[PDB]
Amino acid sequence: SRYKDNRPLNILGIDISKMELGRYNLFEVSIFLQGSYLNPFDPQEIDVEGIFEDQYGNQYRVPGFFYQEYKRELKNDYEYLVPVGDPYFKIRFSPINIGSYKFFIKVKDKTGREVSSDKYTIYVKESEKPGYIRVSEKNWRYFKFDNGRQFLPIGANICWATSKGTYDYDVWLPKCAENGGNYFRVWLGPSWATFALERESVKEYDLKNAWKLDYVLNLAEKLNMYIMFCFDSYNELRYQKEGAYPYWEHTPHYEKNGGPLKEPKDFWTNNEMIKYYKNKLRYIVARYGYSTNVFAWEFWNQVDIISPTAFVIGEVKKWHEDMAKYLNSIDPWKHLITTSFAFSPGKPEIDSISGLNFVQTHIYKSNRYIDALLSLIAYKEKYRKPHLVGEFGLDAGGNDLWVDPNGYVIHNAIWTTILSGASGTAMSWWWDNHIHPNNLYFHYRALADFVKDINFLEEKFERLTNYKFNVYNREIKVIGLQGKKYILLWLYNAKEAYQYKKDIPNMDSSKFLGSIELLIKPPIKVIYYDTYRGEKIKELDLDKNVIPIIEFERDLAIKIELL
Numbered sequence: 015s016r017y018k019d020n021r022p023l024n025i026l027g028i029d030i031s032k033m034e035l036g037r038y039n040l041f042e043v044s045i046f047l048q049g050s051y052l053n054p055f056d057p058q059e060i061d062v063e064g065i066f067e068d069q070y071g072n073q074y075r076v077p078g079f080f081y082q083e084y085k086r087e088l089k090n091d092y093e094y095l096v097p098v099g100d101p102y103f104k105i106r107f108s109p110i111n112i113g114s115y116k117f118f119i120k121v122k123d124k125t126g127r128e129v130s131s132d133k134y135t136i137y138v139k140e141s142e143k144p145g146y147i148r149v150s151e152k153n154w155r156y157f158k159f160d161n162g163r164q165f166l167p168i169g170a171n172i173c174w175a176t177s178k179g180t181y182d183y184d185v186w187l188p189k190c191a192e193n194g195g196n197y198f199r200v201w202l203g204p205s206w207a208t209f210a211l212e213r214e215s216v217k218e219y220d221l222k223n224a225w226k227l228d229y230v231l232n233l234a235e236k237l238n239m240y241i242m243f244c245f246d247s248y249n250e251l252r253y254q255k256e257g258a259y260p261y262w263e264h265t266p267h268y269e270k271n272g273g274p275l276k277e278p279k280d281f282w283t284n285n286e287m288i289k290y291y292k293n294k295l296r297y298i299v300a301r302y303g304y305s306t307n308v309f310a311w312e313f314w315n316q317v318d319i320i321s322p323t324a325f326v327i328g329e330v331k332k333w334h335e336d337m338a339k340y341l342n343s344i345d346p347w348k349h350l351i352t353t354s355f356a357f358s359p360g361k362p363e364i365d366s367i368s369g370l371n372f373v374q375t376h377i378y379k380s381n382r383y384i385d386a387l388l389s390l391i392a393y394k395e396k397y398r399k400p401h402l403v404g405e406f407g408l409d410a411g412g413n414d415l416w417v418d419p420n421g422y423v424i425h426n427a428i429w430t431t432i433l434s435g436a437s438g439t440a441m442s443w444w445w446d447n448h449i450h451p452n453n454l455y456f457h458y459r460a461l462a463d464f465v466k467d468i469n470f471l472e473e474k475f476e477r478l479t480n481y482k483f484n485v486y487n488r489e490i491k492v493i494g495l496q497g498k499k500y501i502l503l504w505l506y507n508a509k510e511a512y513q514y515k516k517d518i519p520n521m522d523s524s525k526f527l528g529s530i531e532l533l534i535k536p537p538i539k540v541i542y543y544d545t546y547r548g549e550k551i552k553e554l555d556l557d558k559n560v561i562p563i564i565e566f567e568r569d570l571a572i573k574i575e576l577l
């Protein structure tokens with residue numbers, strides 16, 4: 015209760031960031047008040063809200079949140095945050111419609127007293143922002159922005175920083191963005207994470223870490239990147255004796271550390287814990303929900319490998335149903351909601367919950383992972399909602415770093431997932447010790463430039479099924495999409511795609527290798543695409559359905575336009 019107050023409830027002053035702003039831009043109200051509360055993070059102690067109304071009858075009820083200003087600096091090798099001023103309350107809003115808005119502030123504290131501001135008027139003009147990310151109504155396999163443009167996530171996990179904190183994201187995000195990346199994922203737990211809200215407590219949230227998440231969200235805004243916020247990770251509910259980076263003994267949920275839980279199993283049903291968790295969701299919506307750069311709320315990293323003493327499928331399912339419904343109801347902008355599992359096939363009892371808007375796969379597999387990805391993507395089409403391969407690698411033990419310095423494993427996965435019908439790229443691990451130091455971003459740039467002008471929302475892509483392969487000197491395989499106007503092929507050498515010792519192909523690719531015959535009607539334009547340099551190798555106009563395959567070392571992309 016470091017932030018208690020026991021004065022009669024009064025608004026003391028408000029600051030408004032701007033009277034005029036663009037569609038989907040941040041409108042921020044700062045509020046100085048006094049009142050009676052033991053915990054500014056608990057709406058039963060103090061409840062700040064902004065009530066906004068556009069000219070079209072839509073009303074938004076935005077919970078407010080407690081805020082401390084900081085000034086960051088880098089002390090040789092660690093970030094250090096210096097508090098500036100007293101903490102206070104904020105409301106963060108983002109307008110969907112343009113035109114005029116009226117809003118007022120309402121506050122209630124534990125005494126039952128209620129105060130409110132007069133109504134203020136703001137004006138919203140048109141802007142360049144595409145809006146929030148939703149499931150496409152045209153093709154449930156894909157995401158869209160509110161303005162109808164596709165959102166095809168290309169990026170990686172970038173879930174926490176080193177001790178340099180936000181200064182690491184100052185380096186990683188611009189590199190990702192300039193190489194076609196528009197997506198990453200961050201962790202808000204366990205308590206050691208860069209953005210951990212529950213750092214010392216499950217009842218009060220860490221204002222420094224929340225400030226760091228502000229900063230990284232703002233950087234994503236400037237770079238047109240979109241973030242999945244992962245609220246909790248399995249480590250929090252896993253006992254030391256169970257291994258796999260366990261954290262229960264250190265987590266603030268545990269009664270030993272001041273929390274309400276005697277054991278991780280009680281997380282799903284303990285009424286005190288459920289109440290604090292809803293307060294946390296309210297804090298997250300209040301502080302970050304305005305942002306169109308929040309791609310999705312993700313409840314859990316790999317909830318299936320919490321302690322087996324704590325996984326009760328019926329209670330975990332009901333908890334996801336109830337929390338998705340609650341989160342949805344208090345989120346004025348209705349961001350996408352998801353959850354994840356370490357078991358690659360997932361848990362159908364939870365994945366089929368309608369409050370979870372898309373499903374995920376995590377897979378770390380060293381052999382024939384191309385076939386595993388294709389198989390999992392075909393399988394999860396049963397849910398009729400988008401599928402994100404949210405984590406991918408060779409080995410949960412990190413073998414990738416030593417055996418694949420050139421990123422061939424990432425390469426194979428991102429081409430396989432895009433051209434098998436997943437909503438976006440497979441999302442690699444190892445951002446800090448693999449992708450960045452080895453400068454593997456060029457793999458994403460080549461993929462992004464290949465799909466850049468393809469509208470997956472209108473192509474009605476189906477997986478390629480009835481081709482004839484005519485290759486003699488090699489075991490070539492193909493993964494393809496067939497659509498209205500395009501056929502997209504990724505061909506790979508089964509003997510070379512899983513060998514990681516050779517240097518990146520520098521292909522002087524003239525010779526004829528073989529052919530693939532497809533059920534299409536000429537004429538067609540065939541584009542051969544170097545997947546490593548990210549450029550057209552050759553372009554060919556054809557009058558027959560026999561498409562030559564030129565020589566390639568490891569793999570080759572082909573884009574075929576139906577004319």
Ligand SMILES: OC[C@H]1O[C@@H](O[C@H]2[C@H](O)[C@H](O)[C@H](O[C@H]3[C@H](O)[C@H](O)[C@H](O[C@H]4[C@H](O)[C@H](O)[C@H](O)O[C@@H]4CO)O[C@@H]3CO)O[C@@H]2CO)[C@@H](O)[C@@H](O)[C@@H]1O
Nearest residue numbers: 206249258259315316356357376378405409410411412443
């Ligand atoms: O060093 C910072 C921080 O690291 C923490 O350990 C990390 C570890 O460095 C590594 O990045 C690990 O990656 C996991 C991650 O958990 C993924 O969600 C996923 O999971 C796997 C799980 O961790 C087990 O390995 C399990 O057997 O397999 C899962 C996948 O099926 O896979 C990633 C790659 O293994 O994440 C942990 C944190 O979970 C802590 O050491 C911390 O103290 C330290 O400060």
Ligand SMILES: OC[C@H]1O[C@@H](O)[C@@H](O)[C@@H](O)[C@@H]1O
Nearest residue numbers: 176178181182183185186450
């Ligand atoms: O920014 C990511 C990394 O960049 C490197 O060049 C070093 O400066 C690291 O200390 C840092 O964590």
